[PDB]
Structure 1
Amino acid sequence: MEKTDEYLLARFKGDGVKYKAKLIGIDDVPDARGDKMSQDSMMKLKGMAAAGRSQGQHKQRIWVNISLSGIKIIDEKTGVIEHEHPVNKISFIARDVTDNRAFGYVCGGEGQHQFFAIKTGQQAEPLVVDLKDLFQVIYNVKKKEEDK
């Protein structure tokens, strides 16, 4: 079937959805959007994560929680909420064309942009689509409530 504003609302309401993953890294970036900018960060962070893995260091295991609250990065071992990014603070979702199991996003206010690189346990696409739908629903709701 098709995903209705009603369906999406129920999906992302409350604790929303949850995905198992690893935090590749965090990088300060100059702008809020950009394919090239995002790729450069992702490649550098993967380079760094690889240098670490060759010395026995592994990426932190996490849960990527998606809901109306936005995105929550949670430590899988402790359950501690490491980062929380409100939907209105996420400016760009970046697909990683070189990896079916990685993606990233830019968040923060102006002058304080950061790229978060994520390595998903499973395919990254479903997580990227959820983010797209989330933004879409928040919009459809606001526009319908504004037209009222």
Structure 2
Amino acid sequence: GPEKTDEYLLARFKGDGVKYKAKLIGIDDVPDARGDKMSQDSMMKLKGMAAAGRSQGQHKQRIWVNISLSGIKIIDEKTGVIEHEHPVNKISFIARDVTDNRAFGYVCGGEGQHQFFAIKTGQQAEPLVVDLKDLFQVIYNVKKKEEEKKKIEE
């Protein structure tokens, strides 16, 4: 199909952007802004905790993952309340889960406050992961355009 463009992505993510059905596996403090191994270690800890909680009758919270130029919003499915919100410039890393096509996570937070959010997607995680890649790419693209913009101004 048609290759993506900056303009297509700006239209896709502006305003309310897009959203996906998911469940929150958990949230973990992590030492670094980025890293595959760190992210997977955190995913495995949180999945272990979720399995323990599930053996005691608990359930993962049902959520919407909302992706827009405003960043990521975690929204409670039942109430519609925004539980968590991170702007684009406070999300540092997107992790795939090599054990689970229906899981992914992201590291977010300012310095010294890195946290891994582990998400169990209702469908395949990949489209959501690709949306995050595209979101970051188009914001980066636009900013570098308006930088080359100003180096030519003088």
**Do both share a fold (TM > 0.5)?**
yes
Distance 1:139 1:39 in 2: 26
CA distance in 2, matches of 1:91, 1:54: 33
Deviation at 1:55, TM superposition (A): 1.1
**Cα distance, 1:35 vs. partner?**
1.0
Higher Cα Rg, which structure = 2
Q: 1:66 deviation in Å?
A: 0.2
Q: Secondary structure in 2 aligned to 1:66?
A: strand
User: How many Å apart are 1:145 and its aligned residue?
Assistant: 1.3
With structure 2 as the length reference, what TM-score do the two structures score?
0.94
> Identity of counterpart residues, as a percentage?
99
Q: CA deviation at 1:59?
A: 0.3
C-alpha displacement of 1:68? 0.2
Query: 1:20-42 CA deviation, whole Å, 9 max, x = no partner?
Result: 00000000001111111111110
Instruction: Provide Cα deviations, 1:57-115, integer angstroms capped at 9, x if missing partner.
Output: 00000000000000000000000000000000001000001000000010011111000
Partner of 2:73: 72
Cα RMSD of the aligned pairs, angstroms, is 0.9
Unaligned runs of at least 5 residues, structure 1: none
Equivalents in 2 of 1:135, 1:54: separation in Å?
A: 38
What TM-score does the superposition give when structure 1 sets the normalisation length? Answer: 0.98
Distance in 1 between the 2:29 and 2:13 partners? 28
Tell me the CA shift for residue 146 of structure 1.
1.5
Question: What is the CA–CA distance in structure 2 between the aligned matches of 1:95 and 1:88, rounded to whole Å?
Answer: 20
Indicate the SS of the match to 1:82: strand
Q: Give 3-state SS (helix, strand or coil) of 1:100's partner.
A: coil
